[PDB]
Each structure stands twice: as C-alpha cells, then as structure tokens.
Amino acid sequence: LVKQLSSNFGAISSVLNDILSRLDKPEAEVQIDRLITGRLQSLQTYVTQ
Amino acid sequence: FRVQPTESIVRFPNITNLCPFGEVFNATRFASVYAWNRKRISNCVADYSVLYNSASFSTFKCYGVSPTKLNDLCFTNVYADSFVIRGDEVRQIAPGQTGKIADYNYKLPDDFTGCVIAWNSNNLDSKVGGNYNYQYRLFRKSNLKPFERDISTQIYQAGSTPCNGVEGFNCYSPLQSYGFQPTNGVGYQPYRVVVLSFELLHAPATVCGPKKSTNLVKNKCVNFNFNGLTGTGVLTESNKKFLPFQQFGRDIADTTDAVRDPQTLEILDITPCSFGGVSVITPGTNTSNQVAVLYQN
Amino acid sequence: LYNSASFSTFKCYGVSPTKLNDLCFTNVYADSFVIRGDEVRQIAPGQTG
Amino acid sequence: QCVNLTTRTQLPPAYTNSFTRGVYYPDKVFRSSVLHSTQDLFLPFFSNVTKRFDNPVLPFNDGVYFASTEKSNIIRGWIFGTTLDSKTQSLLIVNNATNVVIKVCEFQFCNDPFLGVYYHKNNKSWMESEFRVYSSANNCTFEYVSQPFLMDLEGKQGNFKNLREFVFKNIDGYFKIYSKHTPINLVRDLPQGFSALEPLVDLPIGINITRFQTLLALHNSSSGWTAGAAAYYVGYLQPRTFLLKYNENGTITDAVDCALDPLSETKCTLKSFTVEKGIYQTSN
Numbered sequence: 295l296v297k298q299l300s301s302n303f304g305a306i307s308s309v310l311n312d313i314l315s316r317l318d319k320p321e322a323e324v325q326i327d328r329l330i331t332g333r334l335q336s337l338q339t340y341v342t343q
Numbered sequence: 344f345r346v347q348p349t350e351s352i353v354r355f356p357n358i359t360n361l362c363p364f365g366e367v368f369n370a371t372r373f374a375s376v377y378a379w380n381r382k383r384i385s386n387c388v389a390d391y392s393v394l395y396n397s398a399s400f401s402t403f404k405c406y407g408v409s410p411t412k413l414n415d416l417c418f419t420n421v422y423a424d425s426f427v428i429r430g431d432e433v434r435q436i437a438p439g440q441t442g443k444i445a446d447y448n449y450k451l452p453d454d455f456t457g458c459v460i461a462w463n464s465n466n467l468d469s470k471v472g473g474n475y476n477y478q479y480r481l482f483r484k485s486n487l488k489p490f491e492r493d494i495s496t497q498i499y500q501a502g503s504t505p506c507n508g509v510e511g512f513n514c515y516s517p518l519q520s521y522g523f524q525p526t527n528g529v530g531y532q533p534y535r536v537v538v539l540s541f542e543l544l545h546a547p548a549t550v551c552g553p554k555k556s557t558n559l560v561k562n563k564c565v566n567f568n569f570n571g572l573t574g575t576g577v578l579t580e581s582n583k584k585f586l587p588f589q590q591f592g593r594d595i596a597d598t599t600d601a602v603r604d605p606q607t608l609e610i611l612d613i614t615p616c617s618f619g620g621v622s623v624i625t626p627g628t629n630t631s632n633q634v635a636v637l638y639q640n
Numbered sequence: 641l642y643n644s645a646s647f648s649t650f651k652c653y654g655v656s657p658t659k660l661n662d663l664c665f666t667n668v669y670a671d672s673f674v675i676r677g678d679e680v681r682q683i684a685p686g687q688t689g
Numbered sequence: 690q691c692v693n694l695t696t697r698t699q700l701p702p703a704y705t706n707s708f709t710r711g712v713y714y715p716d717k718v719f720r721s722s723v724l725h726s727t728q729d730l731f732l733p734f735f736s737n738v739t740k741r742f743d744n745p746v747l748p749f750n751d752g753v754y755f756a757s758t759e760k761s762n763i764i765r766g767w768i769f770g771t772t773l774d775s776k777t778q779s780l781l782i783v784n785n786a787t788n789v790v791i792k793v794c795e796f797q798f799c800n801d802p803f804l805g806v807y808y809h810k811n812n813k814s815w816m817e818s819e820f821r822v823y824s825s826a827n828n829c830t831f832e833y834v835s836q837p838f839l840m841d842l843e844g845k846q847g848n849f850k851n852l853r854e855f856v857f858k859n860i861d862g863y864f865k866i867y868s869k870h871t872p873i874n875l876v877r878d879l880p881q882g883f884s885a886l887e888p889l890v891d892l893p894i895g896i897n898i899t900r901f902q903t904l905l906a907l908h909n910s911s912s913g914w915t916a917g918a919a920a921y922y923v924g925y926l927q928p929r930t931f932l933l934k935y936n937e938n939g940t941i942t943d944a945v946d947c948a949l950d951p952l953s954e955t956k957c958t959l960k961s962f963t964v965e966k967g968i969y970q971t972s973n
C-alpha cells in the first residue's frame with residue numbers, strides 16, 4: 295500500500311507537491327485527479343483484501 | 344490531529360549572477376533551424392516572469408510547467424534553442440506534432456518540459472540589403488531524433504536513378520528557399536523562437552529563480568522550499584554520510600527524508616510533523632454530556 | 641506513373657507521391673489536356689499571368 | 690611529432706569470465722539495509738572481458754575500463770568519439786603538473802598513433818615532451834571541465850599493489866564518469882569480491898560518440914619505439930535490470946542480476962539475497 299504512492303498513475307509526477315508547484319491550478323487538477331483515482335483504487339483494494 | 348508549521352524556510356544557492364537570455368534573444372544575428380543555436384545555461388539567476396509580462400511576443404507557451412511561477416523553481420541542465428521560422432509555428436513545432444520541422448528539421452520530445460517563446464520581427468534589415476536565407480522544406484529519411492542536429496547533408500538521394508546527381512529528383516534539399524518577399528504575402532517569415540528546455544530532478548540546480556533565502560531551524564515544524572522541492576516537517580541535523588555528489592536521500596520506500604542545504608551544504612533530516620487519530624470516549628448523550636478525548640499514538 | 645524513362649515531368653500538390661501507395665481515395669478524376677510550351681509555373685495554385 | 694610507425698609488437702587479446710564488478714549507483718541516498726531494484730545498462734557479473742593493446746573500438750560509449758599497471762606506467766589520457774575528420778571533438782585528461790588544459794577539440798593530429806604523451810626527464814630514457822594539438826576555432830566549439838586531474842592514489846601497501854576502475858556512459862547528452870582507486874592483495878586476475886564506484890563528472894556535452902582509444906607511450910631511446918609491457922581490460926554495458934544491496938553507510942555492498950541464472954532471477958523477484966526451499970514463479 296505504501297509503495298503504490300510512488301506509482302504515478304498516469305500523472306506527470308508521483309509527488310503531489312511537485313505537481314502543485316509546477317502547473318497552474320486547472321492544469322494541476324487534471325493531474326491530481328489521476329493520482330487520486332489510483333490511490334483510491336489502492337486503498338479500496340487493501341481494505342477489500 | 345496534525346501539528347501545523349510555524350515558519351516558511353526558503354533556501355537557494357549563494358549565487359548572484361544573471362541568466363544570459365538577451366544574449367540569445369536579440370544580441371546578434373539568428374541561425375537557421377537546421378543550424379539552430381544550442382546554448383548551455385548554468386550558474387545564473389533566471390527571471391522568466393519578465394518574458395511572461397513583457398510585450399513584443401506572439402506566443403508564450405509552456406509544456407510540463409505553468410507560464411507563471413517559472414521564477415519560483417530552480418532548474419538544472421538548462422538549454423536555450425534559438426531558431427528562425429515562419430509564423431506558422433502552431434502545428435509545426437510542438438511535442439507530439441508531426442510537422443514538417445518536427446520530422447525533418449528540428450525534433451522536439453513528446454515528454455518535453457519547457458517554454459516556447461516566439462515573436463515577429465518586421466522592423467529589421469531583412470528588407471534593406473538583407474542576407475537572410477537558409478529556409479528548408481525538404482525531407483531525407485525519417486525523423487531526426489529529439490534535440491539532434493545534422494552537420495553534413497552533402498549527398499542526397501531517395502529513389503531510383505542512382506546517378507549521384509540527377510536533375511529529375513528532389514534536388515537542393517538544403518537551402519530550399521530564402522523567399523522573405525518583403526512586404527508581400529501572408530507572413531514574411533521574420534519569426535524567431537527560443538525554446539527553453541528544463542530538467543527537474545535530484546541533480547544539482549544550475550539555474551535559480553530571483554528569490555531570497557531565509558534561515559534554518561533545528562527542532563520545530565516548518566514549511567520548506569529547497570531548490571523548488573517543497574513540503575513540511577521538522578528539520579533536524581543528520582548523522583549520516585552523504586557524499587559530495589549526493590543532494591537528496593530516500594527512505595526504504597519513497598520520500599527524500601533528508602536534503603542537502605544549497606548554501607551551507609549541510610544535511611538536514613526531514614521528519615513529518617506529529618499526527619494521529621482523534622477519538623471521543625463518551626457515555627450515552629442521554630446519560631451525560633461529559634466526554635474524554637484520546638489522541639492516538 | 642511515378643518514376644520511369646517515361647513520365648519525365650512529375651509534380652504533386654497537397655498529397656505527397658511517396659504516400660500514395662498507403663492512401664485510398666474515391667471518384668478519382670483524370671484530366672487529360674495539352675499545355676503550351678511555356679508551362680513554367682503554369683500548374684501551381686499560386687497562378688499568375 | 691608525427692611518428693606513423695610500424696615498429697610495434699602485435700599481441701593478441703586475452704580473455705577472462707569472472708567479473709563481479711562495475712557499479713555506478715544513483716546519487717540519491719538510500720539510507721541503510723535497502724534492497725532496491727535498478728534499471729539502465731550495466732555490466733553483467735560474468736561478462737567475457739577482453740584484455741587489449743591499443744585495439745580500436747566501437748565502445749558504443751557504454752563500457753568499463755580497468756588498469757593493473759604500476760603508477761609509473763599509469764595509462765594516460767584517452768579520447769572518445771575520434772574519427773578521421775574534424776567533425777567530432779574530444780579531450781578529457783591532464784596531469785597535476787604538466788601545465789596543460791583539458792580543452793575539448795577536433796582531431797587534426799597524427800593518424801593513427803598520435804602519441805605526444807611523455808613523462809619527465811627524471812626517467813632518463815623516455816625523453817621529456819608533450820602533445821602537439823592543433824585545433825581550429827573556425828566552425829568549432831569548445832566545452833570542458835579542467836578540475837578532475839586529482840585521480841592519484843599514493844602509497845606502497847599491498848601485494849600488487851593498486852588497481853583502478855572507470856566507467857563511461859553514453860549518455861543522453863551528458864558524459865557521466867564514475868570511478869574508484871583501491872589497494873589490493875596478491876591476485877592473478879580481477880579479485881573475486883565486490884566494490885562500487887563514485888561519480889566524478891556529469892559533463893553536459895552533446896557529442897555523438899562512436900569510437901574510443903586509450904593511450905600510453907612511454908617509449909625509450911634505447912632502440913626503436915619500445916614501451917613497457919602495459920595492458921588494460923575493457924567490458925561493455927547492457928540494458929539489464931539488477932538488485933542492489935545497501936549496507937549501511939548509503940553504499941553498495943552487493944548486487945544480483947536477473948538474466949544470469951534463474952536463481953539470481955528468483956532472488957530479484959523475491960527482493961532477497963537468500964531464497965528458501967520451494968517453487969517460485971519468477972516470470973513467464
């Protein structure tokens with residue numbers, strides 16, 4: 295579950311702060327949504343198991 | 344429960360120099376796209392907010408980064424690529440764009456990070472005894488690979504009749520034109536573009552933004568910015584041996600967990616501020632309104 | 641029709657002759673006519689004169 | 690100083706297969722007790738090593754160099770990407786007391802054996818002199834770092850007594866170099882042990898390298914162009930993945946391949962240097 299944080303699920307960067315400090319607001323939002331989606335899946339998978 | 348930061352610590356190198364953009368932008372005569380000017384930029388401070396705010400530009404387009412806040416980040420391995428092009432830049436020079444330039448003149452990466460800055464130049468000597476030439480609109484084989492440049496193009500054949508020079512062919516591949524055609528046509532082709540390529544990684548920064556630094560702390564939760572790397576936690580002294588070529592650390596999984604300070608070269612460990620779950624221990628509200636609170640771990 | 645002893649003059653506009661084998665079309669029109677000897681730049685879209 | 694000599698001894702290359710060496714780990718520090726996988730092209734633990742005597746390559750600019758000579762016969766500056774034209778540029782090495790600069794430039798020198806290198810009159814045999822470099826600024830650029838000339842390990846302890854390792858990467862517009870000099874006990878070939886190298890330079894130099902040669906020309910004046918019995922070893926890098934073990938100062942103490950032996954593959958998939966009895970599916 296921890297390692298999955300590094301996956302970078304289609305986003306430009308696995309680090310949330312890196313996205314926020316590099317892209318503009320709406321530009322970051324579309325990248326953040328990808329990290330959120332992947333992390334939601336990772337948590338849901340963990341709990342299910 | 345989460346401990347909040349008390350101070351914001353911004354740290355950048357001891358450097359006081361300035362970035363030589365003007366030296367590329369308009370200091371001298373411009374090179375053709377094939378013979379594009381590749382200038383390495385390092386050991387300088389670059390304020391890109393000037394170019395953003397400045398006039399006399401047709402396009403200020405960034406990829407991978409915002410057009411703003413470019414002055415808030417440090418970059419390494421910075422290169423400025425200068426070209427002379429037609430105003431038809433859109434759909435010719437771009438990441439993932441199969442333009443004529445992209446395929447056979449100058450190839451830009453699909454994962455390119457940086458800024459493309461372009462402007463027109465209708466107040467030059469191009470119409471007054473100008474020696475402007477070196478336009479290209481012919482192909483050779485396949486793509487040129489990103490950021491590569493040819494130095495030959497002496498012999499070109501692409502088909503049958505292998506005469507090593509026949510008129511019934513795509514002759515004069517290099518130097519296809521020079522047709523500035525002063526005052527006439529839809530664009531005279533005065534357009535100049537500079538592409539700023541940035542790398543953003545663990546490697547030491549070579550170009551800094553126009554930002555001042557502040558002091559350090561040893562035992563309290565703070566916000567921080569180390570060469571563009573941001574986050575929060577407690578900054579403490581490290582007792583581990585980071586070699587001279589090592590700027591960042593890493594835990595068993597991820598997160599730097601330690602950084603090298605850009606001005607003192609000392610190593611600081613980064614410990615996430617204290618936090619934990621908060622739960623309420625209560626009897627029924629139909630019995631009592633007094634509760635106890637547990638802060639977990 | 642592209643490269644031989646015959647068809648010594650060959651020009652293309654819009655569609656490259658090196659891509660035609662990979663391109664499909666419909667209702668192709670064949671216009672057969674004779675042009676005066678002074679044919680220099682007499683077939684271009686940028687037609688003057 | 691163009692020699693164009695044929696007065697040389699031709700010696701066939703020699704080969705060996707035990708080679709558990711060659712490491713250029715990333716700078717980012719992995720604290721301790723870390724078992725971390727890595728990608729990029731490295732040198733296989735049992736690669737077939739070639740001992741060469743000024744034999745032309747074809748390095749792909751991705752390989753590792755070794756030296757086993759005494760300091761008095763230390764190999765001198767080597768050149769990458771040299772062709773028989775002015776089209777390419779390269780120059781990397783200077784000494785700490787020859788008053789010369791690492792000025793990267795085109796090759797317009799003696800072909801093939803551009804010697805130039807000598808040591809000092811104190812040898813009373815080789816004759817003291819220097820390189821004859823004739824670069825042209827016209828249509829030529831110059832980029833270099835003049836600092837890295839302190840690669841000198843002093844002392845006379847051991848029974849060999851010292852060996853040197855250097856690895857050179859292509860690499861994507863940079864010329865990264867890692868190296869280390871170590872003491873060694875009495876050996877007949879590369880030691881059956883493990884070590885790792887540290888980076889010296891990045892060199893953001895965008896030059897396409899397709900060729901490579903090293904140089905040592907300590908020829909005496911006793912007869913013809915005869916030098917000492919020097920030799921060196923080289924190998925090549927390949928795009929294979931590896932498991933690196935850190936222990937415990939942020940340094941590499943061991944490593945395992947994936948392509949050599951199914952057992953090594955198993956170790957990598959299990960993230961372990963120890964494998965228990967059982968059946969493990971490692972791949973398909």
Ligand SMILES: *[C@@H]1O[C@H](CO)[C@@H](O)[C@H](O)[C@H]1NC(C)=O
Nearest residue numbers: 356357358604605606607608
């Ligand atoms: C910056 O440079 C000065 C010398 O001008 C040096 O004394 C100082 O230690 C360096 N670093 C910092 C944090 O000031």
Ligand SMILES: *[C@@H]1O[C@H](CO)[C@@H](O)[C@H](O)[C@H]1NC(C)=O
Nearest residue numbers: 625626627628629630631632
């Ligand atoms: C609250 O406690 C009183 C005690 O007399 C009881 O009568 C009442 O039903 C309780 N109400 C609820 C909602 O539990």
Ligand SMILES: *[C@@H]1O[C@H](CO)[C@@H](O)[C@H](O)[C@H]1NC(C)=O
Nearest residue numbers: 703704705706707737738739
């Ligand atoms: C290395 O490869 C060459 C290929 O010709 C072979 O002759 C030689 O025996 C090999 N050396 C070893 C030690 O396997």
Ligand SMILES: *[C@@H]1O[C@H](CO)[C@@H](O)[C@H](O)[C@H]1NC(C)=O
Nearest residue numbers: 584935936937938939940942
């Ligand atoms: C780590 O370095 C120290 C010297 O700084 C040394 O004494 C210690 O033995 C090293 N640790 C290991 C495992 O070699």
